């Protein structure tokens, strides 16, 4: 499960990201 595995770490680095402006909504 390498697609979830290192997903565990992206997840933070995708989260941190889209909250930026909290992209959450789905524009992008």
Known sequence: ???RIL???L???F???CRHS???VTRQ
Do not use: D, P, Y
């Open 1 to 3: 499960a390498i697609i």
């Open 7 to 9: 997903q565990q770490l």
């Open 11 to 13: 997840f933070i680095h």
């Open 15 to 17: 989260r941190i990201g």
């Open 22 to 24: 909290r992209i959450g």
